[PDB]
UniProtKB/Swiss-Prot annotation:
The lineage of its organism: Eukaryota, Metazoa, Chordata, Craniata, Vertebrata. It is found in: Cell membrane. Residues 2-187 form the B30.2/SPRY domain. Detected on T-cells, natural killer cells, dendritic cells and macrophages (at protein level). Ubiquitous. Highly expressed in heart, pancreas and lung, Moderately expressed in placenta, liver and muscle. N-glycosylated. This is Butyrophilin subfamily 3 member A1. Homodimer. The chain holds residues 328 to 513 of 513 of the full protein. It comes from the Eukaryota. Belongs to the immunoglobulin superfamily. BTN/MOG family. Residues 2-187 are cytoplasmic.
Length: 187
């Protein structure tokens, strides 16, 4: 459909790979750096400055300061996940709530069937179908971050008219221990 035919004409396909240096030690990054899973117990890793030590998060390797970009994530039958973008200068040590006010623009799924935006307060999304693949779209200049069902092109959510000043990284969060991973689709 139009989603498939037009996405690359309007947004540059980002080739996003996960940065293992940023990943909470309870997270596992795959060899090809496209997939993230949770471990039962934290790995023995250094608490280097780049690493999220409290939030179960991992960043992409590259950030954006301009232009239009997109990437797609296979969420599959996962019961829990959150994805989006965050500012380069988010607090990585300790906790602050994941909200736009704190530099996070994300949405996702909890408890299998509750889709929501990670806002203050959290906002419930009514989706006509559960997505299996989600497209994440950034327009830096207009300040829009949009999410689409990458299979049928349906709209999921848009953060509108954000005044970005900082560089933005793709961000991924998983809390639960389940058989299905969260996986980035290659560009
Ligand atoms: Cl949070
Ligand atoms: Mg340790």
């Amino acid at each position: 459909g139009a989603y498939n035919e037009w996405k690359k004409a309007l947004f540059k396909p980002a080739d996003v790979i996960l940065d293992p240096k940023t990943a909470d030690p309870i997270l596992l990054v795959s060899e090809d750096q496209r997939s993230v899973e949770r471990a039962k117990e934290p790995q023995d890793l250094p608490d280097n400055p780049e690493r999220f030590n409290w939030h179960y998060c991992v960043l992409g390797c590259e950030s954006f300061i301009s232009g239009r970009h997109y990437w797609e994530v296979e969420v599959g039958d996962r019961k829990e996940w959150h994805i989006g973008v965050c500012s380069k200068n988010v607090q990585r040590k300790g906790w602050v709530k994941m909200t736009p006010e704190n530099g996070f623009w994300t949405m996702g799924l909890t408890d299998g069937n509750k889709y929501r935006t990670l806002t203050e307060p959290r906002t419930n999304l009514k989706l006509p179908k559960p997505p299996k693949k989600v497209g994440v779209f950034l327009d830096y200049e207009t300040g829009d971050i949009s999410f689409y069902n990458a299979v049928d092109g349906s709209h999921i959510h848009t953060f509108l008219d954000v005044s970005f000043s900082e560089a933005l990284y793709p961000v991924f969060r998983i809390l639960t221990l389940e058989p299905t991973a969260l996986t980035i689709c290659p560009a």
